[PDB]
Write a protein that holds these residues in place. Structure first.
Motif, PDB file in Angstrom:
ATOM      1  N   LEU C  43       9.115  12.341  -1.873  1.00  0.00           N
ATOM      2  CA  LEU C  43       8.701  11.251  -2.749  1.00  0.00           C
ATOM      3  C   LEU C  43       8.303  10.013  -1.951  1.00  0.00           C
ATOM      4  O   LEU C  43       8.649   8.884  -2.307  1.00  0.00           O
ATOM      5  N   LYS C  45       5.274   8.773  -1.595  1.00  0.00           N
ATOM      6  CA  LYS C  45       4.247   7.993  -2.277  1.00  0.00           C
ATOM      7  C   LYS C  45       4.865   6.922  -3.169  1.00  0.00           C
ATOM      8  O   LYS C  45       4.372   5.790  -3.225  1.00  0.00           O
ATOM      9  N   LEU C  46       5.945   7.264  -3.874  1.00  0.00           N
ATOM     10  CA  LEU C  46       6.598   6.305  -4.756  1.00  0.00           C
ATOM     11  C   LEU C  46       7.420   5.279  -3.984  1.00  0.00           C
ATOM     12  O   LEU C  46       7.594   4.150  -4.455  1.00  0.00           O
ATOM     13  N   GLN C  47       7.937   5.652  -2.810  1.00  0.00           N
ATOM     14  CA  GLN C  47       8.705   4.711  -2.001  1.00  0.00           C
ATOM     15  C   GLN C  47       7.803   3.705  -1.297  1.00  0.00           C
ATOM     16  O   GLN C  47       8.227   2.571  -1.027  1.00  0.00           O
ATOM     17  N   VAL C  49       5.251   2.110  -2.430  1.00  0.00           N
ATOM     18  CA  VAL C  49       4.956   0.961  -3.286  1.00  0.00           C
ATOM     19  C   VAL C  49       6.061  -0.085  -3.174  1.00  0.00           C
ATOM     20  O   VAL C  49       5.798  -1.280  -2.974  1.00  0.00           O
ATOM     21  N   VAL C  50       7.315   0.354  -3.306  1.00  0.00           N
ATOM     22  CA  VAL C  50       8.445  -0.566  -3.212  1.00  0.00           C
ATOM     23  C   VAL C  50       8.502  -1.195  -1.828  1.00  0.00           C
ATOM     24  O   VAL C  50       8.746  -2.402  -1.685  1.00  0.00           O
ATOM     25  N   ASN C  53       5.721  -3.873  -1.553  1.00  0.00           N
ATOM     26  CA  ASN C  53       6.018  -5.071  -2.334  1.00  0.00           C
ATOM     27  C   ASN C  53       7.104  -5.905  -1.664  1.00  0.00           C
ATOM     28  O   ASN C  53       6.979  -7.134  -1.539  1.00  0.00           O
ATOM     29  N   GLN C  55       7.988  -5.920   1.520  1.00  0.00           N
ATOM     30  CA  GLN C  55       7.489  -6.488   2.767  1.00  0.00           C
ATOM     31  C   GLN C  55       6.609  -7.705   2.505  1.00  0.00           C
ATOM     32  O   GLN C  55       6.720  -8.722   3.201  1.00  0.00           O
ATOM     33  N   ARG C 112      -4.555  -4.103  -3.336  1.00  0.00           N
ATOM     34  CA  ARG C 112      -3.634  -3.010  -3.651  1.00  0.00           C
ATOM     35  C   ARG C 112      -3.740  -2.587  -5.115  1.00  0.00           C
ATOM     36  O   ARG C 112      -3.666  -1.387  -5.435  1.00  0.00           O
ATOM     37  N   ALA C 113      -3.905  -3.559  -6.019  1.00  0.00           N
ATOM     38  CA  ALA C 113      -3.974  -3.250  -7.442  1.00  0.00           C
ATOM     39  C   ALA C 113      -5.171  -2.371  -7.771  1.00  0.00           C
ATOM     40  O   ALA C 113      -5.087  -1.525  -8.669  1.00  0.00           O
ATOM     41  N   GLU C 115      -6.503   0.077  -5.937  1.00  0.00           N
ATOM     42  CA  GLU C 115      -6.146   1.455  -5.618  1.00  0.00           C
ATOM     43  C   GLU C 115      -5.113   1.999  -6.598  1.00  0.00           C
ATOM     44  O   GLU C 115      -5.168   3.175  -6.990  1.00  0.00           O
ATOM     45  N   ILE C 116      -4.156   1.158  -6.998  1.00  0.00           N
ATOM     46  CA  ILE C 116      -3.158   1.606  -7.968  1.00  0.00           C
ATOM     47  C   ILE C 116      -3.826   1.977  -9.289  1.00  0.00           C
ATOM     48  O   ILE C 116      -3.477   2.985  -9.920  1.00  0.00           O
ATOM     49  N   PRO C 155      10.340   6.845 -11.281  1.00  0.00           N
ATOM     50  CA  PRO C 155      10.115   5.410 -11.061  1.00  0.00           C
ATOM     51  C   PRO C 155       8.713   5.107 -10.557  1.00  0.00           C
ATOM     52  O   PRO C 155       8.322   5.542  -9.470  1.00  0.00           O
ATOM     53  N   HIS C 156       7.948   4.377 -11.372  1.00  0.00           N
ATOM     54  CA  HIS C 156       6.587   3.952 -11.041  1.00  0.00           C
ATOM     55  C   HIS C 156       5.629   5.133 -10.896  1.00  0.00           C
ATOM     56  O   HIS C 156       4.623   5.035 -10.189  1.00  0.00           O
ATOM     57  N   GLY C 157       5.908   6.254 -11.553  1.00  0.00           N
ATOM     58  CA  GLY C 157       4.997   7.372 -11.391  1.00  0.00           C
ATOM     59  C   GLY C 157       5.324   8.550 -12.281  1.00  0.00           C
ATOM     60  O   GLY C 157       6.272   8.533 -13.072  1.00  0.00           O
TER      61      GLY C 157
END
Ligand SMILES: *[C@@H]1O[C@H](CO)[C@@H](O)[C@H](O)[C@H]1NC(C)=O
Ligand SMILES: *[C@@H]1O[C@H](CO)[C@@H](O)[C@H](O)[C@H]1NC(C)=O
Ligand SMILES: *[C@@H]1O[C@H](CO)[C@@H](O)[C@H](O)[C@H]1NC(C)=O
Ligand SMILES: *[C@@H]1O[C@H](CO)[C@@H](O)[C@H](O)[C@H]1NC(C)=O
Ligand SMILES: *[C@@H]1O[C@H](CO)[C@@H](O)[C@H](O)[C@H]1NC(C)=O
Ligand SMILES: *[C@@H]1O[C@H](CO)[C@@H](O)[C@H](O)[C@H]1NC(C)=O
Lengths: 246, 198, 237, 50
Positions: C43, C45-47, C49-50, C53, C55, C112-113, C115-116, C155-157
């Protein structure tokens, strides 16, 4: 030494980038070319600290002559601390143009090799022969996709000037950048909500599974919600929510 | 080699990509679409092409009674491709634009080093050897600010270009998956007409 | 069985192998939890993002301690240590630096937004096409022949479980394009002509199931002197 | 320059991410098959010229 045909009145030389690359000696009339001294970057290759503490050093784009006993020259530069072998494996740590490095027991050391694309195969084509399967297999695979990110808001005055009135009056003279910043952040947050709204809100009805969980021998207990726990999540969802943690 | 600017080599060489392409070609020639969903199964080529004709909505006897004509048409169409590519001057503009953009960006970044930004000179070495410490900082600060701004502009432009490059790569991967490893029914996705192969 | 018919296999193949298919599906489902738990970077890809943010926020907060060419990085002391007619010179540099930091942060967030949003659009299309129906696009809802898909939330995905059909245990066979009989060519309706060595049958696409060649699974449509590689044998009525 | 801050760390991070994505693009596009198939020595395919 320079092979440049200087006219008897020029003194210096320049290039496309407009930097000095030639000069004539005042005491002895002779044209000399000037080249920058060698420079580059250094990269450190290492396995996990739990595995070992040995490291290898790569000087990027540097001839090995300029710079423990084992030294190798790759098209990416000079590698020190690794040994090269003919054995081709799947890539472990990328280095450069088709060169990879790994930690192998051989005892344990760091080796460098050329990556292998795969296993060689050759199907027997012919005029009148065909191949037909006689059995099947049911496979299940997983895919993970991000959807949204965190929504944040920023206050200009508190971040820049805190609670200083003089700083606020000085900043008021600059213009209207903070309005644009607020607009951008608000748009980002609204789009973040809309992403989940579009992805998940597909159906307009809330269907419920029948009380009896028989479907001709198919077992769906791992993906259906678990009523015992309070949050009403499937075991796989529980594992997913437990794995991802800040 | 510029001033702190270096170019890194790609991980995969050209020969490796050529080997990948050759493997794909051999698989799709000797197995059809079977090797893209499991083990590769052998099949004669006319039988596979008759299967594709059946896929587009034409019976097999149409192909089996016109094999030589179809082969001749395919051979001529393949032969014309090299001449079509060579004759057109702007055939490969998309691939040349990337190199042109990269070279232009690097040249602009290098050329920006000769601006003064409001100082006596654009060279630090002379200022160090011509002035004294308590007054060189005033000149140095402007150069620092200008060069930092140039670097930030370059980085932002590179990110914006990389996004579009990634989108194009994703489209190319989808096309390779759907038009080469199988037969597509989407209109105008793998050429104009009724798709057969790629 | 309808889905099996969709991928190109007859219903009796499934109806005669129900228990085996159910057992295979149950085992494949059971292995998924172990596969997810064992892999450490399952996981990532989901980590990411956090991590990004956190950093970004940490860098933005840490930037508040720079001086940018002033006596101090704290306004409160400068206010209580200097006089009004000379504090503006120090304040201006701090203002400029903090404004530049804010602009950099906002630009990075926008980039970043974008690509999201693209990833979210792809996820929505996949949910529409692989879960609410059966797809024929290659490698779009897994590897193999697509059967169905199941969604799960993270989470987030989102996480998709694709069920696919894979052939196995192939065999050699000898084939012919058409069958000649009574000076007439015969082509299979659906399937392919096959031979074990002495007799000729007609079998289906992705499962070996020989049948006796009959006029009910073939059509004539032609003559015997045009097809290349034709093989002549009796055709039952 | 050390007095300004930590812009260079961000610049390096961005460039490194760009390079890694550049490698990943080719990896995703071209590395589709896991086997290296080879064409038969005889180049006859029913009259088709490759
Ligand atoms: C390193 O120096 C030697 C000196 O003879 C030269 O032959 C060699 O080509 C150099 N390596 C590279 C990569 O240029
Ligand atoms: C690879 O094999 C060749 C065969 O001649 C040999 O010359 C070369 O030294 C080998 N590479 C090594 C041992 O790293
Ligand atoms: C396949 O058939 C052709 C006739 O079109 C024949 O010339 C060729 O030799 C055959 N292939 C082999 C391997 O015999
Ligand atoms: C099909 O025939 C080829 C060539 O004789 C052989 O190599 C292959 O193993 C055969 N297939 C099976 C499943 O045995
Ligand atoms: C091929 O099929 C016929 C029909 O039953 C059978 O008699 C024959 O034994 C089969 N061939 C072999 C090698 O078993
Ligand atoms: C049937 O096939 C054989 C072998 O190809 C051939 O010799 C024979 O003439 C064919 N039968 C007729 C009626 O042509």
């Amino acid at each position: 030494e320079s092979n440049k045909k200087f006219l008897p009145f020029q003194q210096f030389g320049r290039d496309i980038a407009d930097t000095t690359d030639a000069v004539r000696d005042p005491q002895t009339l002779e044209i000399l070319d000037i080249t920058p001294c060698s420079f580059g970057g250094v990269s450190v290759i290492t396995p996990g600290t739990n595995t070992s503490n040995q490291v290898a050093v790569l000087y990027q784009g540097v001839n090995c002559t300029e710079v423990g006993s084992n030294v190798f020259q790759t098209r990416a530069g000079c590698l020190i601390g690794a040994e090269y072998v003919n054995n081709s494996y799947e890539c472990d740590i990328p280095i450069g143009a088709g060169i990879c490095a790994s930690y192998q027991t051989q005892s344990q050391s760091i080796i460098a090799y050329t990556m292998s694309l795969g296993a060689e195969n050759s199907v027997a084509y012919s005029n009148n022969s065909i191949a037909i399967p006689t059995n099947f297999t049911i496979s299940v695979t997983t895919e993970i996709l991000p959807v949204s990110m965190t929504k944040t808001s920023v206050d200009c005055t508190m971040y820049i000037c805190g609670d200083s009135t003089e700083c606020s009056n000085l900043l008021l003279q600059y213009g209207s950048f903070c309005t644009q910043l607020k607009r951008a952040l608000t748009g980002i947050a609204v789009e973040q909500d809309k992403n989940t709204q579009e992805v998940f809100a597909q159906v307009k009805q809330i269907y419920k599974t029948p009380p009896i969980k028989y479907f001709g021998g198919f077992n769906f207990s791992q993906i259906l919600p678990d009523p015992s726990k309070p949050s009403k999540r499937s075991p796989i969802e529980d594992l997913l929510f437990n794995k991802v943690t800040l | 080699k510029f001033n702190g600017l270096t170019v890194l080599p790609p991980l995969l060489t050209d020969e490796m990509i050529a080997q990948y392409t050759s493997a794909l070609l051999a698989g799709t020639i000797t197995s059809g679409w079977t090797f893209g969903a499991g083990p590769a199964l052998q099949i004669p080529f006319p039988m596979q092409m008759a299967y594709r004709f059946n896929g587009i909505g034409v019976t097999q006897n149409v192909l089996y009674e016109n094999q030589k004509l179809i082969a001749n048409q395919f051979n001529s169409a393949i032969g014309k491709i090299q001449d079509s590519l060579s004759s057109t001057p702007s055939a490969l503009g998309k691939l040349q634009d990337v190199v042109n953009h990269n070279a232009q960006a690097l040249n602009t970044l290098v050329k920006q080093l000769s601006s003064k930004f409001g100082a006596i000179s654009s060279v630090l070495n002379d200022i160090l050897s011509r002035l004294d410490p308590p007054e060189a900082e005033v000149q140095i600060d402007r150069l620092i600010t200008g060069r930092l701004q140039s670097l930030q502009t370059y980085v932002t432009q590179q990110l914006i270009r990389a996004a579009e490059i990634r989108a194009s790569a994703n489209l190319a991967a989808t096309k390779m998956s759907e038009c080469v490893l199988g037969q597509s029914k989407r209109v105008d996705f793998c050429g104009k007409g009724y798709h057969l192969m790629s | 069985a309808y889905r099996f018919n969709g991928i190109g296999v007859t219903q009796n193949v499934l109806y005669e192998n129900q228990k085996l298919i159910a057992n295979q599906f149950n085992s494949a489902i059971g292995k998924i939890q172990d596969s997810l738990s064992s892999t450490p970077s399952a996981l990532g890809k989901l980590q990411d993002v956090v991590n990004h943010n956190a950093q970004a926020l940490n860098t933005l907060v840490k930037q508040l301690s720079s001086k940018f060419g002033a006596i101090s990085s704290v306004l409160n002391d400068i206010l209580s240590r200097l006089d009004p007619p000379e504090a503006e010179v120090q304040i201006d540099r701090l203002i400029t630096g903090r404004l530049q930091s804010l602009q950099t942060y906002v630009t990075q967030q926008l980039i970043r937004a974008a690509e999201i949003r693209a990833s979210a659009n792809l996820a929505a299309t996949k949910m529409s096409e692989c879960v609410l129906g059966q797809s024929k696009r290659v490698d779009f809802c897994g590897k193999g022949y697509h059967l169905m898909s199941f969604p799960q939330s993270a989470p987030h995905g989102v996480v998709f479980l694709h069920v696919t059909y894979v052939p196995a245990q192939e065999k050699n066979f000898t084939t012919a394009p058409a069958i000649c009989h009574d000076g007439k060519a015969h082509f299979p309706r659906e399937g392919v002509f096959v031979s074990n060595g002495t007799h000729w049958f007609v079998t289906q696409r992705n499962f070996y199931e020989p049948q006796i060649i009959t006029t009910d699974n073939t059509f004539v449509s032609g003559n015997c002197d045009v097809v290349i590689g034709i093989v002549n044998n009796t055709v039952y009525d």
